[PDB]
Amino acid sequence: TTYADFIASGRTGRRNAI
Amino acid sequence: GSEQESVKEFLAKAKEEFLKKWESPSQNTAQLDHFDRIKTLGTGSFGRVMLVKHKETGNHYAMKILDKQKVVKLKQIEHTLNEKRILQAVNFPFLVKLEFSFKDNSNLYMVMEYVPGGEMFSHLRRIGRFSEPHARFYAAQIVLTFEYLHSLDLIYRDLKPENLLIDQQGYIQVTDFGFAKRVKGRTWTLCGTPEYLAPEIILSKGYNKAVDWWALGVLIYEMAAGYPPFFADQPIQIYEKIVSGKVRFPSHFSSDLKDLLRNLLQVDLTKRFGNLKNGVNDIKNHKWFATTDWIAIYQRKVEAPFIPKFKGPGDTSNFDDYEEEEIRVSINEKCGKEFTEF
């Protein structure tokens, strides 16, 4: 699922700026 | 019009007040030993934010402490000076208020209102996703906040749930102006957070305030879906997805929400809502916002859909726990010339 793909991205935590 | 001419008059008054404070910023309105430190609320590359108690009054505040040497090392002088200048000059219901600022031999200090409900980010990950009415309530606040900021020629450039605090009444407070810029025309800096970057930033074009309306589209999508529209293991793969004009929507998104998002997540600048001849009114008048009473939101008279749990003043349960480190103040003045205007 898209949600599972989001979990697999590893980017579910707080995101820093570039 | 009637309502129309009210908005024009309001924003003209707002610009006059902003410009006066912009041109003569406040400085040096407290000192460190006026406060007791309570708990670290967050930490960053060149500082941290602490919950503090004003000794005289007992009032609590969030104090941002920036290490001057680290700010210089990280090439953040102008961004730091600019953030404080903006914060002391703006005035809007959904923007965090600066209460005091000062500096010492080692650090810069910005003492802001404490927003005890924590970041939207935590509530969203905890709950999973927000229903459309809930997402719409927050979105309306951002639309109004961008109308205000853009009327001052400020581009925000760092919208994301991580930067939206929830106050005691359930309303949003925007807190972090470290990438905001006063820009009448275009600007060129590559900055922001990968998932929220507009394509024209990724493609190294000159860009304008339309990037904030793209980011609103990303925010609304993430709030209503529980995950952002463009994600991947590495930012470079995220950028490839963003500049494709491809998006997929969860099957539970309403037709009105999808239509709004198609027009905010519009790679074509000439077509993106917020950047057309009718400006922000294309967004305010969109079918998804038909039930939104814009004035009632502004006046904070709408019942919020979610009220955070608050066990009193100084309750920090909605922030993470961090290792507490000393606040050392050097005997030697560091970087004095660089921070004269703070």
CATH code of the domain containing B291: 1.10.510.10
Structural domain span for residue B267: 119-302
Structure obtained using: X-ray
Asked if B71 contacts B46 with a C-beta cutoff of 8 angstroms, the reply is: yes
Interface of A with B (CB under 8 A): 2-3, 5-6, 8-12, 14-18
Cβ burial, residue B341 (10 Å; 0-12/13-18/19+) = exposed
Q: What is the resolution of this structure in A?
A: 1.9
Chain B partners within 8 Å of A16 (Cβ): 193
**Measured CA distances, B258 to B249, B287, B317 (Å):** 7, 11, 35
Which residues does residue B163 pair with via DSSP β-bridges, in sequence order? Answer: none
Which DSSP helix (H) or strand (E) runs through B240?
Answer: helix B235-243
Asked if B214 contacts B220 with a C-beta cutoff of 8 angstroms, the reply is: no
Q: Is B71 annotated as a binding residue?
A: no
Which residues 72-131 of B are in CB contact (within 8 Å) with A?
Answer: 119, 121, 125
Q: Is B341 annotated as a binding residue?
A: no
Over B162-179, what HEC string results?
HHEEECCCCCEEECCCCC
Tell me, what DSSP letter sits at residue B304?
A: P
Contacts of A13 (CB under 8 A, 6+ apart): none
Q: What does the alpha-carbon distance between residue B159 and residue B105 come to, in Å, rounded to a whole number?
A: 33
Q: Is B47 annotated as a binding residue?
A: yes
Q: Which one from B33, B104, B153, B158 is the annotated catalytic residue?
A: B158
